[PDB]
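Re: export button greyed out
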Amino acid sequence: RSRKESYSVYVYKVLKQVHPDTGISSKAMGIMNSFVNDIFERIAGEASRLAHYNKRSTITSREIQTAVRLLLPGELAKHAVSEGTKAVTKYTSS
Amino acid sequence: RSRKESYSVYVYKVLKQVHPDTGISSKAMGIMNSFVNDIFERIAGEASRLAHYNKRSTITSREIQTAVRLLLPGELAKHAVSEGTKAVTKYTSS
Amino acid sequence: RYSQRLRRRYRTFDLEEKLHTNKYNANFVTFMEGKDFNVEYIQRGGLRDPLIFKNSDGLGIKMPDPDFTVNDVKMCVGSRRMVDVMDVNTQKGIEMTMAQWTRYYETPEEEREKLYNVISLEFSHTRLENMVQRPSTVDFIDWVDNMWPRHLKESQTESTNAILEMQYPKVQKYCLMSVRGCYTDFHVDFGGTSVWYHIHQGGKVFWLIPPTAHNLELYENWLLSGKQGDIFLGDRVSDCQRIELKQGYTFVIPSGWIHAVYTPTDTLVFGGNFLHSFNIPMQLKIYNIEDRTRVPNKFRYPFYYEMCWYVLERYVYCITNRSHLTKEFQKESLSMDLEQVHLTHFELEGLRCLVDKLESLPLHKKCVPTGIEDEDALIADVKILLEELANSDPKLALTGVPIVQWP
Amino acid sequence: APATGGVCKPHPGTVALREIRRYQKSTELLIRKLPFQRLVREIAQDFKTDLRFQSSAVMALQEASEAYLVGLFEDTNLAAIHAKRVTIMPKDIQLARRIRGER
Amino acid sequence: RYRPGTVALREIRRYQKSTELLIRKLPFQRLVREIAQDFKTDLRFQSSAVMALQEASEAYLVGLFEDTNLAAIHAKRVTIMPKDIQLARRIRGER
Amino acid sequence: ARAKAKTRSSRAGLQFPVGRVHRLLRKGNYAERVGAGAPVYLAAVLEYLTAEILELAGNAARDNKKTRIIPRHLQLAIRNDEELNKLLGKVTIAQGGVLPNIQAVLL
Amino acid sequence: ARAKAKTRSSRAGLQFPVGRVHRLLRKGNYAERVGAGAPVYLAAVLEYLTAEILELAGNAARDNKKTRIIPRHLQLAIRNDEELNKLLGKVTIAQGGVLPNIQAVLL
Amino acid sequence: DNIQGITKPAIRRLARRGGVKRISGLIYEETRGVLKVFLENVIRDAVTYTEHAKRKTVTAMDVVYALKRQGRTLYGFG
Amino acid sequence: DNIQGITKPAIRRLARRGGVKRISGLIYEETRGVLKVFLENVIRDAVTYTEHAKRKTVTAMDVVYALKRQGRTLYGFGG
DNA sequence: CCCTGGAGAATCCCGGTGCCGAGGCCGCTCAATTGGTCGTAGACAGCTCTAGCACCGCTTAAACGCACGTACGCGCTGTCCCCCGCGTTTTAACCGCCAAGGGGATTACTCCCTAGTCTCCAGGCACGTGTCAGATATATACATCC
DNA sequence: GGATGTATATATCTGACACGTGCCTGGAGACTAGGGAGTAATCCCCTTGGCGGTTAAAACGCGGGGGACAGCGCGTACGTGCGTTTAAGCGGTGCTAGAGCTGTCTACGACCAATTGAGCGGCCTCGGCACCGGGATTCTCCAGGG
Ligand SMILES: CCCCCCC(=O)N(O)CCC(=O)O
Ligand SMILES: [Fe+3]
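Workaround output, generated via the alternate export path:
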């Protein structure tokens, strides 16, 4: 028998950081999985096209940053870029 | 010096088999090149997604035919499928 | 969490101001002594003015013991009697047993979930009936007592208002039981009936609006709008009196008066409805508002047109001695009996309205009752009679005795 | 229940607003199940013979169709309000579909 | 003299036949540079980027005006007003 | 003795996985090579978006005096925002309904 | 002894390049491996569409008493056909103009 | 003839959820045709997707992909 | 105040090519605002594309890509 | 004609079912970690030269501002039909239970097709040159608006 | 009919399109090896089909009043023509900066081998709400006795 993958456990982890008492049904979990997959697909495709346009063969964090600035509206992009930069900085320091 | 590529010669060859008297300007040639590139990219992307959906790592003529059926409207799909089938059949035999 | 952009949220008139304002300051009600409320007074005035009797001297009423409780009412009518209850918040009806009503009424105020009111408990033909007597003068002029075939009335056994068991219009004696805070929105009593209303215990506040043609149009329009929770009608009219009835008062409300009622304290009331011959035009007018606003028959005067036919017959008979009852109804009436004339203008006007009304109804709405023989000949006779009585001397008609009485 | 007589109790377009407020608050599907299934199977019978359907496929199709129709009705309402009216007509739907780019 | 509504038809027929640009070049270039100054300073521009922008803008406006005319005809009129533009742009999805 | 292992997610300070995202990027046919900082940045962005959505949905759910999140709350939160409504403009949410809207000319 | 070469276009009977299409498919980041029948099919489809559009444009040009083809002829050919106007619905042609059309109410 | 199974009360309910007060008597025949066109397009795309995979059962993933190809992404079915 | 460069006769010519017969007097400001919004929307993407490539000159391919990102494919300026 | 007790029944404090969706441990298999090796992709320094910017004159085609008058937008009445609300009879949608078989999902395994290499060489791209298709000037012919 | 907008038809310039060559690098021919998929066998899930019971939604008819549509009058704002003012286009100068290309050196991501713990599927609780459920406390129907 074969097993499948999902994002349920990380959704629970994030939910227990902003609203500890409340729960969530299964339909909302499926909706959240679809949303995460859609956003990942969008960003990956845009970064791939950006890498192609400059005669490059690799994808780095600069491409992902440019794709985030292109796809997200308004201050959402600002906060996303700030948090991603913070995460990268804290990861490379180790 | 670097040399670039285009589809001008093949477009001119196709034009001469249906209108031996008629010429063409450069702007129309650029437009035709853009059209060819657009159609190529559309078909290739659809075929890639079709390949990914069925857990496969190769692109064959079956997926190209399916993409042609999905993209082209009405009789265009029929004639294109017939032309492609004839071309493949004639190429395999030799 | 933090590090986000950095919210939002995910009866319409005030009955208390209608009780506090001083703007409902019309003077429509006459305070009277019981002794002056007689048939002569009705003949001369046509029972056009709302009356309060601050005491019952001279009225001829009888009430039960002054500490009578809702549980006493319950034992007199039966724990299992189904009672129509009004949900005050919605002005809609529900049904429960009298024992269930009693439990609600005996529940402390803070423990009651909703406000419910009982305004429609007709207790004729129960043990409570003989404990309550209405003003004497009403007996002389009530169409039920004076016009309806007596052998039918006497045959009633059912104590509920079940229509298939009802032998006469059973609208004469009602018990109303109202908790503090109850409110009945503006209305006109069914069929254009006049109402007598006695505060046995407690108190009531009435807003009174006169039945001018303008106010009755507003009333009908307000009913047809369906926006009665949104609009306090007493604001929309020319003139309105708010008045308090206290314990022991008796109130008489003439036909057609538009009125709303608030209950400031737990209260018990005895009252009842009557049609009479002195304001027929208004009676008919109200009936036609009920028809046009599609009031269900449940909330209307039973056997209304039937009663009107019997009224015409009694007038003809008492004045000319010509009966339009069936032989069998004549015989029933004769058996019971063995156990130049001047009408008021009120009556003359009334009877011409009545004849014109009944004659003009189509067959399927005429409601000719079973006691009536030839309704066309009765009509013909009333027309002749009204021509011959058209010169009635208004002075001489003030006899103090009704034209129509049983011998 | 037997009919009661002598029981006392006080008391176009008004019901429409209440219906709008009721339906704009719920979330269930507003079309029946079996007729939609039969319509879908009849439509699909034209492209292939002896086809089978999962239940979730029909559910998704029904939901998408209802969402499309609701959006079209909102746009038709805006079109009708444009021409100083309150009643929607087929030409409103035609104008909405033509401006949207569907025609 | 000509009655109103005859020169307009002549201009419509004239301009549905031609294919040139209907806006001047220097004001458009000035507007483009003035807008672009708000994102990055000291930007240079090729000779064909402004032409492409002009073509795209003109096509957009012509399509918008066609939809606006449809909206105006709907309301039993022959004159276009801002509310027609607002309705068309709202139904399209841009607002 | 080989040093005790430690996941890259903890090393960066995240809850969303990094190795799984790295594998998806590597086997997703996007480029010939994949760098070393892309999965961390992408996981951070996805976690941020998920946290915003969940916070709004929880607020909307509690405002109705309930303890559980259902698709209606997600729909209300998404459609009542101004920036998340632009990113999910062409998306249909199953069993979510519509916002209450009545034109003034109709009332 | 290497025999004389022969392009695959000549073998299939096409006027569009096959090896170039194969290279573009290979280096375009589309799939891990590419079959041997895709390029000829794609070239045939592209050639058919090109020939159709060119024939329509040539007829449109001949209607105007000219011997060359300009963007106006391509625009007229595309917008005068029911099938090509649906495949290229959202495409703008530089220096193409519009189609003659006047509403009946204004006339 | 199953299109007649979409009864007038259902169309009225859909319009009420849309926000419509009054409805003319000719709307239903237009709505039915619109629904026919939409369903025909979606089902044709889903059938082509199903046929490509050499199956005889139309799964929900085929419908999801067909809807996504037309620009009507749907959430809640995989 | 460069937006005033788009003059009334140019807008009337565009409207004539669109097929209108009569034009009110309050159309020009709306048209100018719509055009300005469209221009900012395109130029933001074009400048982002230029910035990513470590350049200082906006080329034609940047504009073409920005237009293509919004479903407004343009033929004749490269591809 | 008043009590009364042999059956009655209502619902219901509450004393049990019983499904329903979440929520929590256990085993364990496969995927993420860790430790090395290398070879090519990308960063950086340097030089060239194409095109973008700034400027000056002047021709003139286009934009601007005014008169005006008429025709299209807008408001007010009337009438008549079409749509809404309500009651009653009719129909089929929905739910529980049962049965059967079509077809989707998994697993060996065999081989044939596609990837990576090494040369040969011709198809196509950059650089040059002529002539023929197209613009525009200018004196009539005819249909079209007033 | 008269005035005006548009089509009719010939002359001459003119510069861009089509035809030539030189050569260089990517496509073609021949070779080897390895793993992806094609096919058969198997199992069990889940889709189709049927029937009975219940009742909630659909359909049909009638009354009436509210809105849609046509008709008429007013009035002001927009289209048309003209005399005046402006800067857009075009031709030619001058400079320089930044895009494009070449050559090195290195350091970072792919591949391989050995290891272990994380998350996933399968059972065990756990607090609700929809019914039951004798029976039974309170109040009660009913022809007898008194
Ligand atoms: C029809 C019964 C007799 C009259 C009493 C009921 C009535 O109609 N009221 O005006 C009194 C309302 C109240 O007291 O809350
Ligand atoms: Fe009353």
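The longest strand of chain E covers residues 44-45. The button fix ships in the next patch.
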